[PDB]
Amino acid sequence: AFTQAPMLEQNKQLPPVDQRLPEKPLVIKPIASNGVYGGTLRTVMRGNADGNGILRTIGPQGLTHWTQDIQTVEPYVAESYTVSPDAMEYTFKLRKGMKWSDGTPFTADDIVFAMNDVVLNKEMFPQTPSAYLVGGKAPKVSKVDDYTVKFEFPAANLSFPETLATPLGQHPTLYQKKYCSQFHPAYNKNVQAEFTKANVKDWPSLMRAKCSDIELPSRWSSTERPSIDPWLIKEPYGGAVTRVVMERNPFYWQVDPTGKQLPYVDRIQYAVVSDLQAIILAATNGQYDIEARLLGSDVTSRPLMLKNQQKGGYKVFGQTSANANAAGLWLNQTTKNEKLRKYMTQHDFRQALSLAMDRDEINKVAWLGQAAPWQSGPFKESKWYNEKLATQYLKLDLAQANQILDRLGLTKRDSDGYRTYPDGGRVSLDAIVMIDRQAMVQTLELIRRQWQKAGVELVIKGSERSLFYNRATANDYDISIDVFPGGLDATLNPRAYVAVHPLESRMSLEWAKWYLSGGKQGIEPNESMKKRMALYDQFVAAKTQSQALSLFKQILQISADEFEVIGTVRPAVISSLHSLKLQNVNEKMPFGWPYATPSLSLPQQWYFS
């Protein structure tokens, strides 16, 4: 019936391929042509907390999957699903005979465990991941039969199929009950004895160490953790390693239109590189079969990238980024700097800071003129376009900026020429940045010089990714620089407009913590944010598309009125590459986190000619 990769003939112990596949495997139509088996996919990740590079290469294996044009989703791990007319009850039919990577059955037992015993367990997650919540309230997940599972939300949830296609929506398929139950007190009477083995002190830490989460490095650091991924870890991430190797999953659950069990490619090899510049040189020498993640936003190197295409044996292709802003200033409304906070919370202060910026210079210098000035709003083709949110305060007006700061009472000056607070102290903002992000650091250096003309001091504090996230969650920053999503993905990724993302809504993560705990932790936000949060809960629970359109447009307008985050430039074209020998890469796919790119292009059907 079906066939398998020749390298699998080398494992005597494997059942015949028809018995490893579901009775009805998901048939994957290829991007361009039917493929052939073999080869090793060479790509790259960074050394510091870059496990999402693996996830965005092999792809989240969720209940649904985006179409190539990201306009809709289709059943993926689920064979099919039905929705009740009121959008509250979702019933998923699973593929009979489907198996985990260890050969054991993948059934509704696994999805019910993942939801009820892990995701929805409040000791595991004191705040339930919001992907599964409606207005902060959880669904009831129940087994219908071995191959049918039901989600019952307490209100309409029109967007749940889209959520289930994003990386943060993939919990339902991430936890094998058999393996993970040994680390759960509800199942292992002796789970305590597992703590000393893993050097943890409680079972949630145990569960994270052994069974992982969406973005934890532990997801890729063991070989024994079962999954339904197209490739499995063989040489793990985590240690002081310079290379990660994944190998085809003999129990992968898909075929191509001729009946070949996928993936076509036998192995993936990630170079784990300590420094950016080395990635650039190896890429320009053709050492990577695909790179469409780390080098996409470095306009400085596309001349050499383009130049060495023929010598390196690769093709450069452009992608449209979903981000509204390539490098935006998240201003901390809950900055611990008491003197600064009195001005940070004033609209006109933030407006002055934006008017003192010269986005044409940033474009020219940091982006070789290939980006364009923008704040944080959706693009004009978006049904969510808001002119004010996109274009207010974009033109340099130093005189106007200085007049505002004068009017706010920052008219005293120190010996170096900077403005001071009325009661002493230089007007100074600390900006945290990831040191490996060259365009972002360069953006802050240009802004520092620009804001000096307004008598304001910007202080650059660079670190690797871990400490950068640690400082943010500690509320230890005045500014954080990173992308503003929303150009194309505003409802999937609304972090810049309302403080709902626990790690990335950095107008205040204490505000987000307040929202995500029902006001039990964190810092109560101001009236405009509490208003947007209430509207956001109404939007997620909207009964009709017209109500959802009205509600979310209200959120964007309030966000525009408030002007809480300051954009520099919307992204230039994303520069990606793949080997000329690598076939079936969708060179037209958009770029972005909610689609896990480049894995949106279905890497299980990439192949080498």
Ligand X SMILES: O=C(O)C1=C[C@H](O)[C@@H](O)[C@@H](O[C@@H]2[C@H](O)[C@@H](O)[C@@H](O[C@@H]3[C@H](O)[C@@H](O)[C@@H](O)O[C@@H]3C(=O)O)O[C@@H]2C(=O)O)O1
Q: Which residues contact ligand X by CB under 6 A?
A: 52, 56, 215, 294, 296-297, 321, 323, 437, 482-483, 504, 574, 592-593
d(CA 390, CA 26): 42
Q: Which is nearer to ligand X, 478 or 504 (CB)?
A: 504
Q: Cβ closer to ligand X: 213 or 482?
A: 482
Structure tokens at 521: 């932790």
Q: Which is nearer to ligand X, 176 or 599 (CB)?
A: 599
Q: Which of 314, 370, 317, 371 is nearest to 576 (CA)?
A: 317
Residue closer to ligand X (CB basis): 539 or 593: 593
Cα distances from 133 to residues 208, 505, 541, in angstroms, run: 21, 18, 10
Which residue has tokens 């403080």?
A: 499
- Taking the least distance from each CB to ligand X, the nearer of 262 and 574 is 574
> Smallest distance, Å, CB 53 to ligand X?
7
| Cα separation, 196 vs 219, whole angstroms | 20
From the list 594, 542, 498, the residue with the least C-alpha distance to 157 is 542
Q: How far apart are CA 506 and CA 484, in angstroms?
A: 11
Shortest Å, Cβ 232 to ligand X: 21
Please identify, using beta-carbon distances, which residue of 88 and 483 lies nearer to ligand X. 483
Rg of the chain over all Cα atoms, to the nearest angstrom: 25
Six-digit token string for 169? 């929506």
CB of 366 to ligand X, least distance (A): 13
| Minimum distance of ligand X from residue 479's CB (angstroms) | 15
Which residue from 265, 120, 90, 100 is spatially nearest to 173, judged by alpha carbons? Answer: 100
Task: At 48, list the tokens.
Answer: 């510091």
Closest CA to 349 of 289, 294, 427: 427
Nearer Cβ to ligand X, position 48 or 452? 48
Helix (H, G, I), strand (E, B) or coil at 571: coil
Q: What is the dihedral of CA 549, 552, 557, 563, to 10 degrees?
A: -150
Nearer to ligand X, 254 or 325 (CB): 325
Q: Which residue is nearest to ligand X (CB)?
A: 52
Sort strands 40-46 and 267-273 into parallel, antiparallel or unpaired: parallel
Q: What's the closest the beta carbon of residue 47 comes to ligand X, in angstroms?
A: 14
Which residue's CB is nearer to ligand X, number 73 or number 574? 574
Backbone dihedral region for residue 246 (phi beyond 0: left; psi -120 to 50: alpha; all else: beta): beta
**C-beta of 370: minimal distance to ligand X in Å?**
13
Residue 44 or 405 with smaller CB distance to ligand X? 44
Whole-angstrom distance, CA of residue 603 vs CA of residue 593: 16
Closer to ligand X at the Cβ: 35 or 592? 592
Closest contact distance (angstroms) between CB of 46 and ligand X is 9
Measured from the CB atom, the residue of 249 and 321 that comes closer to ligand X is: 321
Q: How far is the CB of 214 from ligand X (least distance, A)?
A: 8
Smallest separation (angstroms) from ligand X to the CB of 215? 6
Cis peptide bond upstream of 139, omega within 30: no
Distance between CA atoms of residues 303 and 300, nearest Å: 7
* Residue with Cβ nearer ligand X (7 or 216): 216
| Cβ neighbourhood burial of 199 (10 Å; 0-12, 13-18, 19+) | exposed
Q: How far is the CB of 222 from ligand X (least distance, A)?
A: 20
Which 8-state DSSP code applies to residue 568? Answer: -
Peptide bond just before 598 cis, omega within 30 deg: yes
Q: Which is nearer to ligand X, 27 or 281 (CB)?
A: 281
Backbone angles phi, psi at 41, to 5 degrees: -85, 115
CB under 8 A, 24+ apart: contacts of 444-450: 444/481, 446/358, 446/361, 446/362, 446/365, 446/366, 447/329, 447/357, 447/362, 447/568, 450/356, 450/357, 450/358, 450/361
Minimum CB separation of residue 277 from ligand X in Å reads: 13
Phi, psi of 351 (to 5 degrees): -60, -45
Residue 79 C-alpha from the chain's centroid: 26
Residue 292: CB minimum distance to ligand X, A: 9
What 3-state DSSP class applies to 339? Answer: helix
Paired with 179 in beta bridges are none
* Rounded least distance, CB 507 to ligand X, Å: 15
Q: How far is the CB of 49 from ligand X (least distance, A)?
A: 8
